[PDB]
Amino acid sequence: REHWATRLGLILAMAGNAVGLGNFLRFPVQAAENGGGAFMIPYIIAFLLVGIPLMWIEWAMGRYGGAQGHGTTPAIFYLLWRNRFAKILGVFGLWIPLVVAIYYVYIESWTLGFAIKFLVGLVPEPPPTDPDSILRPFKEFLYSYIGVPKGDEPILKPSLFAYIVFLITMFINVSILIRGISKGIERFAKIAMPTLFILAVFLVIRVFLLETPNGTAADGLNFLWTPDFEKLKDPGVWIAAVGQIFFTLSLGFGAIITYASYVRKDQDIVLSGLTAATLNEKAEVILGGSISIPAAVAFFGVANAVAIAKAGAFNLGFITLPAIFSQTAGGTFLGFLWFFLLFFAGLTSSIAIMQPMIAFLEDELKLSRKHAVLWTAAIVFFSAHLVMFLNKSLDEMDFWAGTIGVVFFGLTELIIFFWIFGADKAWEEINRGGIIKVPRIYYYVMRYITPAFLAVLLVVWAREYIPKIMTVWITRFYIIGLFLFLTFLVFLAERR
Numbered sequence: 001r002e003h004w005a006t007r008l009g010l011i012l013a014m015a016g017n018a019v020g021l022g023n024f025l026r027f028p029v030q031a032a033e034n035g036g037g038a039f040m041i042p043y044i045i046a047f048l049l050v051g052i053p054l055m056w057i058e059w060a061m062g063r064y065g066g067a068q069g070h071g072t073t074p075a076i077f078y079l080l081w082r083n084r085f086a087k088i089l090g091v092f093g094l095w096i097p098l099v100v101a102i103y104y105v106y107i108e109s110w111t112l113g114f115a116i117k118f119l120v121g122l123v124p125e126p127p128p129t130d131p132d133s134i135l136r137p138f139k140e141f142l143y144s145y146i147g148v149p150k151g152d153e154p155i156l157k158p159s160l161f162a163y164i165v166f167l168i169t170m171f172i173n174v175s176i177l178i179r180g181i182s183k184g185i186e187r188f189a190k191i192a193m194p195t196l197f198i199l200a201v202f203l204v205i206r207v208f209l210l211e212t213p214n215g216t217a218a219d220g221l222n223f224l225w226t227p228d229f230e231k232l233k234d235p236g237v238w239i240a241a242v243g244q245i246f247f248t249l250s251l252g253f254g255a256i257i258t259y260a261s262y263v264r265k266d267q268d269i270v271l272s273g274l275t276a277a278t279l280n281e282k283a284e285v286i287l288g289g290s291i292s293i294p295a296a297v298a299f300f301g302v303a304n305a306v307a308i309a310k311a312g313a314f315n316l317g318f319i320t321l322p323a324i325f326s327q328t329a330g331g332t333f334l335g336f337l338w339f340f341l342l343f344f345a346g347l348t349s350s351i352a353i354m355q356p357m358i359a360f361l362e363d364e365l366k367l368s369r370k371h372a373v374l375w376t377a378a379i380v381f382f383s384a385h386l387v388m389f390l391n392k393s394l395d396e397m398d399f400w401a402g403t404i405g406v407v408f409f410g411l412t413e414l415i416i417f418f419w420i421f422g423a424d425k426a427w428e429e430i431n432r433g434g435i436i437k438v439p440r441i442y443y444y445v446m447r448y449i450t451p452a453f454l455a456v457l458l459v460v461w462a463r464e465y466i467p468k469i470m471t472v473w474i475t476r477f478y479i480i481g482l483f484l485f486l487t488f489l490v491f492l493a494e495r496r
């Protein structure tokens, strides 16, 4: 079985798995929509009670399975719980990263295409002192690239350039993935993560220098770090906080498990997972939180920044921030750096979510690495046409697979590992070979606090939020077919 070549490379590949678009696009939106600093008290709490324990649990399950040649949750759930229903529940660990990949690589292609056009200077030229006169050209720029209808008709018409960039992005993902774990993902992570850090630091420094008559970036930093204890009672704040922790840490996507399956049987996983989780949080709260919101607040004020963030997740990243840059010296090249930062973040994360499907085809169906990568590329590329041309299909996939799915699967893996497989056996497997050992209190957090926390979250989410959500049926129909297809592939694997 393949294994990570170096200790540093494993850490940077796991950091590249965690540090993604969610750090710079989803997190600023989630923070601004939920009270700014009010979002930060539950966030930190969730990171301590859910993020860190589930990270260690997914690392342990990955390495345990990889020691037996299984990097995917169907086989791993069966090894932890010899039952056919465990294999069915494992199918979710292939279904989530596939559906997430279908729209995540497409969003990644957006960043690459915007990076290209901004580098070449093919950007709108707003008239040099109206907020709408500056925002509207970039709103049309994004709407033309993805093909947003001027009305609400549910058909999208992406530009030919966007489609070509999507093919190029799929090609780039394949070129990295086809070279394996050590010579592909690891070697590229060693390059992308320093590039990602440097770009983020330069953007943070440049944003800190922004001052307009409406405020400064310091006001955005204040808003982000001003506590609001009156929101701690709101369940919606905790739902967003835990969902953001799940998303940003790649928990419940099956990616951490698959990556950890290439960690050697005796190599450390406690400090490694802790370092990767800490690197992700530094990138998120320090770097991600200091670019979008501070620049937005500096130009528009705290009032309009929150309103723009409420306009959607893409508005802050693809319309507002490029427009704000368009009013500063050289801001087009600054916008290029922003989208290039986003692209490397998306790329290091997209290779991670597509590795589970690759690992299943390699481990269980005995396909070659080339054919596993190429067939995974085919399934993702083909299925992506649904997201490309059917309006609001991307949102439905992110809800079922990337939002409810990850929390349900996180509770599922925790219960299989710490309740069915054995709390003491799981604790021994987590701490085995660790350069440091997990604090004793976390044993009770993993056994009682985390599953009770996640169970209450899911119950609240089901009773209070999902009935309202219940052409979206086309997307539901298709992703159900994807689950049946993976179920059939699991059936073929066990029959072999």
Ligand code: MET
Binding pocket: 017, 018, 019, 020, 021, 022, 023, 104, 247, 248, 249, 250, 253, 255, 349, 350, 352, 353
């Ligand atoms: C594509 S891996 C899941 C998302 C990733 N953790 C992010 O923060 O963007």
Ligand code: NA
Binding pocket: 018, 019, 020, 021, 022, 023, 247, 248, 249, 250, 280, 284
């Ligand atoms: Na992240």
Ligand code: NA
Binding pocket: 015, 016, 017, 018, 019, 020, 021, 344, 345, 346, 347, 348, 349, 350
């Ligand atoms: Na990434």
